[PDB]
């Protein structure tokens with residue numbers, strides 16, 4: 492739900 | 503006995519771990535310096551350590567076979583809730599019962615009760631945390647078991663906010679059966695005695711530790727001078743309703 496940093500580290 | 507798939511899964515988790523947990527702790531030099539003056543003197547250093555550790559747990563999670571079939575939303579939910587838990591788990595590797603501390607190769611990077619208590623958290627957390635470490639240490643887990651537990655801990659279908667639980671559940675059972683079978687075929691008795699039951703119990707201890715952590719995190723994050731000593735990733739994962 493809008494976690495750019497986490498999202499970015501996950502992709 | 504075991505299984506080719508299961509042995510595959512084990513091989514992957516061990517490597518994923520070796521790639522995300524540096525036994526030399528060489529990267530610790532980059533953190534804001536530790537200060538052993540709560541005085542909160544340790545908050546800047548431990549905040550960086552934790553933040554860094556979140557990045558490593560994420561890196562390990564991505565390599566968990568099956569985790570890639572999950573949606574980002576689910577992946578984000580699973581990591582947000584498991585991060586602290588997996589960090590307490592992986593920290594067992596550096597924890598020693600000799601002096602009850604996290605020996606991270608270096609006196610400056612050797613943490614005990616009074617150090618980890620100087621970051622805005624109370625013994626209501628630290629006490630159970632060390633107890634947890636001891637109990638987990640006493641299990642003398644094979645490293646194969648260690649990584650399987652971290653992986654099972656990450657892919658738990660009951661985490662709040664999970665969507666495709668069935669898929670999460672499928673992925674986890676796969677890891678569980680891998681664990682259950684490895685203990686049976688590769689972990690000799692007596693050390694194998696009720697080992698799976700004792701490891702699943704540690705997952706319950708982690709929830710408890712996690713819960714207490716959320717409570718004490720919010721407490722100090724609701725104080726601007728404290729939350730500004732944290733890192734952007736910590737604020738995102740742990741919460742930023744500051």
Ligand SMILES: CC(=O)O[C@@H]1CC[C@@]2(C)[C@H](CC[C@@H]3[C@@H]2CC[C@]2(C)[C@@H]([C@H](C)CCC(=O)O)CC[C@@H]32)C1
Nearest residue numbers: 548549552589590592593596604613618621623736
């Ligand atoms: C942002 C935040 O506020 O982070 C908090 C900083 C204090 C404190 C009490 C809480 C609970 C988790 C604790 C942490 C202190 C440092 C510990 C004891 C880590 C070990 C030094 C890890 C050793 C290793 O990597 O092997 C792992 C568990 C960590 C998190």
